[PDB]
Paper text:
Similarly to other eukaryotic (Di Costanzo et al., 2010) and prokaryotic (Bewley et al., 1999) orthologues, plant ARGAHs, are binuclear manganese metalloenzymes. Together with agmatinase, formiminoglutamase, and proclavaminate aminohydrolase, ARGAHs are grouped with the Ureohydrolase Superfamily.
In this work, ARGAHs from two model plant species, A. thaliana (AtARGAH1) and Medicago truncatula (MtARGAH), are structurally characterized by X-ray crystallography and small-angle X-ray scattering (SAXS).
Numbering used by the authors:
A (entry chain A): 20 to 91, 95 to 338
B (entry chain B): 20 to 338
C (entry chain C), D (entry chain F), E (entry chain D): 21 to 338
F (entry chain E): 21 to 91, 94 to 338
The structure:
Amino acid sequence: VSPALLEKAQNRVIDAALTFIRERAKFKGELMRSLGGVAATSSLLGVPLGHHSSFHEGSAFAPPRIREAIWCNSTTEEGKNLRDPRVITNVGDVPIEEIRDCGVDDKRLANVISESVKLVMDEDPLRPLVLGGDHSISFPVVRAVSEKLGGAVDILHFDAHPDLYHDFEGNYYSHASPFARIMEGGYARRLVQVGIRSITNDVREQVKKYGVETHEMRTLSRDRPILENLKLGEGVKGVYVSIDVDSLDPSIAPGVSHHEPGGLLFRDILNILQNLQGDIVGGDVVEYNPQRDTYDGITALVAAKLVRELAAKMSK
Amino acid sequence: VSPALLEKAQNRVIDAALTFIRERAKFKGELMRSLGGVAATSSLLGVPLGHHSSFHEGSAFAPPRIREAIWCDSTNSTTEEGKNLRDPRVITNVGDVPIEEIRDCGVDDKRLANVISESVKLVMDEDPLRPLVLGGDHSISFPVVRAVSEKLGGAVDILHFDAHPDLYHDFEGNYYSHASPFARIMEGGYARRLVQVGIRSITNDVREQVKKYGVETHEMRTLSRDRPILENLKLGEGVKGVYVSIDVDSLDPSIAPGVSHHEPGGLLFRDILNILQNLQGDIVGGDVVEYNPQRDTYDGITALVAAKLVRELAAKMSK
Amino acid sequence: SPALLEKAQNRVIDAALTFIRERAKFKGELMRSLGGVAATSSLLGVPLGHHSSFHEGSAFAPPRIREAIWCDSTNSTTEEGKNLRDPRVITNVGDVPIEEIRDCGVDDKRLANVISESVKLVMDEDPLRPLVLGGDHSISFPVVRAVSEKLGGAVDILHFDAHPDLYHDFEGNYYSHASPFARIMEGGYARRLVQVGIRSITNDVREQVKKYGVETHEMRTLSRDRPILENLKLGEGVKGVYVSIDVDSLDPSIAPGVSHHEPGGLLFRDILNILQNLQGDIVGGDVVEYNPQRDTYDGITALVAAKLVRELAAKMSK
Amino acid sequence: SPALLEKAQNRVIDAALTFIRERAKFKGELMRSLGGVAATSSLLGVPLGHHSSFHEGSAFAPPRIREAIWCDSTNSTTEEGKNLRDPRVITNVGDVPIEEIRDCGVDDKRLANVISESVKLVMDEDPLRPLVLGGDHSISFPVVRAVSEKLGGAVDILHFDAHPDLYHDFEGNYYSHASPFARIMEGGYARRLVQVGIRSITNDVREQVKKYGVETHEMRTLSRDRPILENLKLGEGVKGVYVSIDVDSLDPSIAPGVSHHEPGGLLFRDILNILQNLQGDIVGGDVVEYNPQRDTYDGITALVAAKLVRELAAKMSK
Amino acid sequence: SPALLEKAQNRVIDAALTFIRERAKFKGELMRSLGGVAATSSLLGVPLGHHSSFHEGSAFAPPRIREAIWCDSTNSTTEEGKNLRDPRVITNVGDVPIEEIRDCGVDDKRLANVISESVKLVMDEDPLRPLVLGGDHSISFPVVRAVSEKLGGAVDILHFDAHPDLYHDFEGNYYSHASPFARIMEGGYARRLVQVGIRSITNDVREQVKKYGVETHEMRTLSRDRPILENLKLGEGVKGVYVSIDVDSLDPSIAPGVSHHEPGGLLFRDILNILQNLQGDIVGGDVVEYNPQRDTYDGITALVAAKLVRELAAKMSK
Amino acid sequence: SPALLEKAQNRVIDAALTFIRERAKFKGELMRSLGGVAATSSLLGVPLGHHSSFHEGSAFAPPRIREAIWCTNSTTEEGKNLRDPRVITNVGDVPIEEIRDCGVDDKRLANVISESVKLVMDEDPLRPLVLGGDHSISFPVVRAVSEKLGGAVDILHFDAHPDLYHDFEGNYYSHASPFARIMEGGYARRLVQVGIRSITNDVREQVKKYGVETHEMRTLSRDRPILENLKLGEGVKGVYVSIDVDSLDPSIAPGVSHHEPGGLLFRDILNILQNLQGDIVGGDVVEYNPQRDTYDGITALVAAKLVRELAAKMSK
Ligand SMILES: [Mn+2]
Ligand SMILES: [Mn+2]
Ligand SMILES: [Mn+2]
Ligand SMILES: [Mn+2]
Ligand SMILES: [Mn+2]
Ligand SMILES: [Mn+2]
Ligand SMILES: [Mn+2]
Ligand SMILES: [Mn+2]
Ligand SMILES: [Mn+2]
Ligand SMILES: [Mn+2]
Ligand SMILES: [Mn+2]
Ligand SMILES: [Mn+2]
C-alpha cells in the first residue's frame, strides 16, 4: 500500500469535509445575522464516532436519529420556538467513516473534530451543540471551545461513569478517558458530575487530583438543593454542558451501550439544566445508541428532548 | 420402573451432587483462607428450580445468566460503595445445585429441599464463606433459611423485598409453593423479625398470616411515611444474625420486566440500595430470586438488575 | 339512497342500544339479587380511535383490559383488600359496537349521542355506575355529558394526562381527543377540573386553563404538589366526582402502549397515591388511550390499564 | 336464581342476533342497490378463544384483521386485480358478542347455536356469503354446520392447518379447536376434506383420516403434491366449497402471531398458489387462530391474516 | 433573503460534490496502482427517504449497510469465492449529504441532479462502477439517468421489487419512490426492464407495463418463469446492465426491515439464483428500501442488504 | 500456592465426572431393566461458548433445548414415543463454568468432555446425543466416539460454515476449527457438509486436503436427490451427525450467533436426516443461542425438533 497515496487522500478528504462544515456554518451564520435579534443560536454538529467505545459502537449512528426526533409540540418546556432557526439550527455531521477509511490515526481525527467545532464558533452568532457519537468526542470539543475562547470553562457533566480513566485499555482516546484528557489540559476549572453510579477507586484518586465535584446517585437525595441551584462560569470563559444519555436509568433510556441500573429520572436532568445559571458557550449530547433502543425509539425522543432543552438554555 | 433401582439412583446421584458442591466450596474456602485479611466472603450458590412457581418456571434458568451479567463487559468490577469484585474475598462462585438431574431421578420435593439445605451447610462449613443463593423461584428461601438457622443454632431476622408476602398457609395444596416460603419459615420459628418491603399484592387471608406471626409488612401505599424507618433498620440484635431475601419482582416491572409476576407500582432500583446501604446487622446469608430470563428484554436488562442486586448484597455481606 | 341510510342507521343504532340495555339490566338484576351493595363499578367499552391525531389503535383496548383484569399472574384482591371475584365489586356490561355504527355512515355528533345513551343505560340500573374503557380521550366528553345530565348537575373531575386536552380547535375536529375537556367546561358539566401529569402544553392552551379555572398540575411542580394531590377532596356541594385516567399520563417506561410517548411522566405509584387517597362520591370514570398496537410483547400496558381499572373500581364500588 | 339466567340468556342472545340481522340486512340492501353482483364476501367476526389448549388470544383477532385489510402500507387491489374499496368485493357485518353471551352463563352448545344462527342471518341476505374471522378453530364446526343446513346438503372443504383437528375427544372438550373437523365429518356436512400444511398428527388421528376418507397432505410430501394442490376442483355434485384457513398452517417465521408454533410450515406463496388456482363454487370460509397477543411489534401476522382474507374474498366474491 | 440562498446552495452543493470527487479520485488511483482490475464496485450512499409514502426510515440505511458488510460475525468471502478484503472487489466512496443540502432549501429536481452528478464523479474514475445504497426507490431515476447519459445510450434493467414502481402520478410527487421506473422508461434511459418478485400492482399500472413493454414477472407465475429467470441475458445491443434490488422484493419473514411489508415474496436464494446466473455487462446497481427503523433488534435486514450488496459487487467487479 | 489450584482442578473434575458416571450408570440400568432396546439416545449437555468468535450465549442452550423437548405433541415425525425413556433420556450437563473457574486450560477441558462422552458409551445401550454449546465441542466428542469404537466414523454435518480453519486467530479450540481438528486426527473418513454458504478460499484448500464432500447452498437444487439418499458408515465404525442450528435460514432460526442469509428450510434438514442410511453411533445439536432467540423461543423449539428427529434415527 503506497504511503504518499494514503497521505494525500488523508489531506484531501479531511479538507473537503471541513470545507463542507465551513460552507454550512457560513450559510447559517449569515442567516441568523439577516433575521437579527439574536446573541446566540444553538448549532448542531454531529460527530458520528463509535470506535472509542469499549462495548458497542452503535453511538456512531445517533446524530441523524436525534435530529429526526427533534423536528418531528414545537415548543420547549419554557416556551422557546424550535422552528425559529434562531433557537436551534443544523450545521451537519463530520464524515468520520470516510475520514477513517483514509487511514487517519486517532490524534488527527481528534484534531478534525476540534477544527469542525472552531468552524462553527467562527460564524457569529452560532454556538456549538455537538451530537455524539461516544463520549470520547467531548475532549476534542471542549479543547476547541477553550482554545477559541482563550481560557477555561466550567462543566456540568451528566453520566453514570466519571470518564476520568488515566489509562483505559491503552487507548488514550477511550470514551472512558475524555475528562482525564480535559483536566490534564487545563481546559476546565470546575467539573460538576451528576448521575455517577459506576466508579473505581483509582478514579476516586483522579477526582481528588483534579478537584472534581463528583455527585454519586447514593447521595442524590442529600444533593438535590445544590444540584437544582448550580451557578457556573463566574470568572472563566463560560459553561460547557455534557449529557451522557446513560446518566438516565435504563428503564427510561434503554438506547445506550452501558446499562447501569439506579440512574437519573428525566426530571432530574431537566430540573438541574433549567435551574443552571451561567453563560453556556457549548454542550454535547452523547452515547445515544439507536441499535439498542426500543422499536418505538423512546431513547431518540429522550435524546431529542435533552437537545431541545440544552438549546433553549444556550440560545439567547 | 423397579422402585429398588430408582431409590439407589437417587442416593448415588445426590451423593455425587453434594460432593461436587463440597469440592467447589473447599476450593473457594482455602483460597480465601490463604489470601487472609477476610472475615466473610459472599459465595454464590445457584438453585435453578422453577417447578414451585404458580405461573411461569423460567426463573430455573436464572443463575448462569446472573453470573454472566455480574462479570459483564459493559460494567467495571467496583460496587457502588467502593468494593472490588475482582477480589475473591468480596465475591466468589461456588456453583449450581443440579436440580433438573436430581428431580429426573424421581426425588420428591421434601428430599429436594433437604438437598438444597445440605448445599447451604456445605458453603457455611467453609468459613469465611457466606451463602448468597441465586434462584430460582422464591420456594428456595425456606430450605436456605432453615439451613442457615439450624447451622447457626437459632433464629435470624429477615429483610425480605417482594411484591408478594409469600405467607400463604396453603397455595394449591403445594407445601413448597413460591407463595408459602415465609409461612414455612415462620411456622418453623427459623426467623424472629421478618421485615417485608415493596408489598402491593396481598389477599385478606394472608393479612391474617401477617398479624398471626407478627410480620412487619410494609406496603407500597405507606412507603413515603415508612422511608425514615426503612432507611435506618437495625436487625439481628440478640439473635444469630440477618438474612436478606430479594425477590426481583419487588421492583417496578418498568425496571425488572424479567419476572413471572408483573405487579405495577413497585420499588425503584435506588429504593432497595438506600435500605441495603443503610441496614445494620450481621448479614449471615441472602438470596436473589425470581429473575426469569425467558421474560426479560432482548438486551437482558433484568439480568443486569439481578447482577447489581447480587453485587451490592455481596458488598454488604462481605467483610 | 337517502332513506336506506337514515333507515339503516336508526335500526342498527336501536339494536346496539338494546344489546347494552339487556346486558345492563342483567347485571343490575344480579347485583340487587345478591344484596348488600350501594355501588358496582360496571365496565362499558367504547372502542373508538378515529379521533386520534397520530394512531387509532386504542380502539382495540377494552377487551384486552378486561382480559388483563382476570389474568393468570395476579390475584383477585386489590391493594386495599377488595375482592374482584365479587360481582358487586366489578362487573362487565359490554362494548358499544362503534366500528359497526360508524360503518353505517353515522357522523361523530350522532356517535357522541350513542355513547351518551349507552352510559345512561348503565346508570338506569342501580346500583351500577359506569367505568368506561376507551378508546381515545374524545369519549370523555359524551360520557361526562351523560353523567351530568343523568345526575342533574355538575361533577368535579380528577383527570390524569400528559396533555391538557383543552384545545378550542385541534385541526377543525370538534370531537378531537385533544379537546374533550374544552367541550365539558363549555357545557357546564364540571365545576373543578384537577389535571395531574401535564408535561405537553402550548401558550394558547395555558389561556384556556386560566379561562375555565382549571387546576392544571405540571410534572415540573409534582414533588412540591404531592401533599395537595395526596389529599384531594372533590365533589362536595355538587353531584360528585368523575375520574378520567389517560394512560399516557404515565411515563412510557411504565406504559409504552400509547399513541403519544411523552418522557418525564408519572410513576404508577404516583397515580395510586392520588387515587387511593381521593375523598368524594365517585359517580363514574374512564381509562382511555391504552393502545395495544404499541404495547410490548408481554402486554404490560394492558396489565397497567387493568390495575388502574381495578383500583378505580375499588374506590367507586361500595 | 334459576329464572334470572334463563331470561337474561334469551333476551341477551335475542338482542345480539337482532344486531347481526340489522347489519346483514343493511349490507344486503347496499349490494342490491349497487347491482352487478352475484356474491359478496361478508365478514362475520366470532371472537371466541376459550376452546384453545395453550392460549385464548385469538379472541382479539377479528378487529385487528379488519384494520389490517383497509390499511395504509398496502394498496387496495388484490393480487389478481380485484378492488377491496368496492363493497361488492368485501363488506363487514360485525362481531358476534361472544364474551358478553358467555358472561350470561351460556354453555358451549348454545354458543355454537348462536354462531350457526349468526352465519344463517348473513346467508339470508342475497348476495352476502359468510367469511368468518376467528377466533380459535372450534368455530369452523358451527359455521360449516350452518352453511350445510342453509344450502340443504354437503360442501367440499379445503382446510389449511398445521394440525388435522380430527380428534374425537381432546381433553373431554366436545367443542375443542382440535375437534371441529371430526364434528363436521361425523354429521355429513362435508364430502371431501382436503387438508394442507399438516405436520403434527398422532397415529390415533391417522386412523380418523382413513375412517372418514380425508385427503390429508403432509409437509414432507408437499413438493411432490404441488401439481395436485395447484389444480384443485371441489364442490362438483354437492352444494359448493368451504375454505377454512388456520394461520398456524404457515411457518412461524411468516406467522408468529398464533397460539401453537409448528416449525416447517407453509410459505405464504404456498397458500396463494393453491387458493388463487382453486376451481369451485365458494359458498363460505374462515380465517382462524391469528393471535395478536403473540404477534410481532409491526403486527405482521395481522397483515398476513388480512391478505388471506383479501385473497379468499377475491375468490368468493363474483 | 434571496441572494443568500442562490449563494449558499451552490457553494454547499459544490463542497458536497468536491467531497465525493476526492473519495472517488483516492479509490480510483488505488485500484489503478494495484492493477489486474477491469471494474470495481464502488458504494455511493444516497440517504434519502422523503419520497416515501408510508415511512422514511430508509434514509438511515447506507451506514447500517456498510457496517453489516464489514461485520465481525461474517467473513470477507462472497458465495462464489471473491475476497471483499481486496479493494478491487468492493470499495466505499461515501454518502451524498442529502439532509444538509435539503436544509439549504434545495428543491427535489436540484437534489436529483446532485445525485446524478455524484454518480458521474464515481464513473469518471476508471475503473470504478457505481453500486448505490438507498435510501428509497426514488433514487433509481437520477442514478440510472446518470449511468445512461454517461455511457451515451440505453441500459437493460433487472429490477427486484414487490412493487412495479411504474405510477405516472403518485400523489402529485414526480419524484415518488412508486414512480422511478415511469421516469426511467419515459426518458428512454432503459430498453428492457425485467421485474421480479412483483405481487402489489393496480390495474392502471398493469396498463403502464403493456404500454412500456415491461417484462413484469409476478409471484403467482414464478415456478412457470424459473427456467427463464435463471438464464437471463441482458444488455446485448445497448451499453450494459443495471440491477436495482428493492429489499421489499424479499418475503417479510426474511426482510422485516422495510417500509411496505408484502407477504408471499422472494426467498434470499431466489435473488442469488437469478443474479448468480445473469449474463451481460453490469454497469451499475442499487440496493434500496432497507429501513433500519423497522428492522428486528438483531439487525437481520442490515445483514440481508449487506449480503445483497456483496453478491452484486462480486458480479459487478471484474 | 499453585498446589491449591492443581488440587482444586483434580478434585472438582473428579467430582464432575463421578456425577456424569452415576447419571449414565442410572440410565443404563433403567434401559437394560426395561428391555426391548439396542440403542437409547442419551442427552449430554456441554454448556461451552468461550470458543465462540462473536457471542457466547450458546453456553445457555442445553437446559433450554431440554425444556422445549418435553414442552406441541409427544411423537417423533415417524411415530417414536418420546415419553418412552428407551427413545430419548437425559444424562446431564458437564459443569463447564465450574471446571474453567478452577483454572483448567482448553486442552484439559477437551479431555473432560471426551471422558464424559466415554462414560455415557460405557453404559449399554446408551449412545451420546450432545447438546451444545458452540461447535468447538464436536472435536472432543467425535474423538471420544472414535477412540471408544476403535476406529473412524463417517460424519453428516449441517452448517452455514465449514468449520475447517487450520488456525482461527491462534485458537486451536475455535468453534471455527473443530472439523480441522477431527480430520487432522483421522477420526472421520467421509465428511458430508450441507448448508454451506460462508466459505473462504483457504478453507476450500482444507476441503481438497481432506477429501471433504462440501455441498454449498448455491448447488442445493442439483444436490437434492443425492442428499436425500445418503448412505454412510459402511466399512467404518459408523455415522456421527453434527447439527449446527445456523445451517437453517435466520428467518426460521434467529437464535444463533452467526446469521447467514440464504440457508436451509426445516424440511431440508428433516428430509436429509430421515432418509439417511448407516449405524448412527453419536451426534450433536450446537450453536443454539437463547440470548438471540425471539421472545417466543422459536429457535429452542426448532432445536428441540432437531434433537427429537436425531434421537428417533439413533435410538432402536
Ligand atoms: Mn460518558
Ligand atoms: Mn456513560
Ligand atoms: Mn417472592
Ligand atoms: Mn414476588
Ligand atoms: Mn387525554
Ligand atoms: Mn394524553
Ligand atoms: Mn385448526
Ligand atoms: Mn392449527
Ligand atoms: Mn421499489
Ligand atoms: Mn418496493
Ligand atoms: Mn459450526
Ligand atoms: Mn455455523
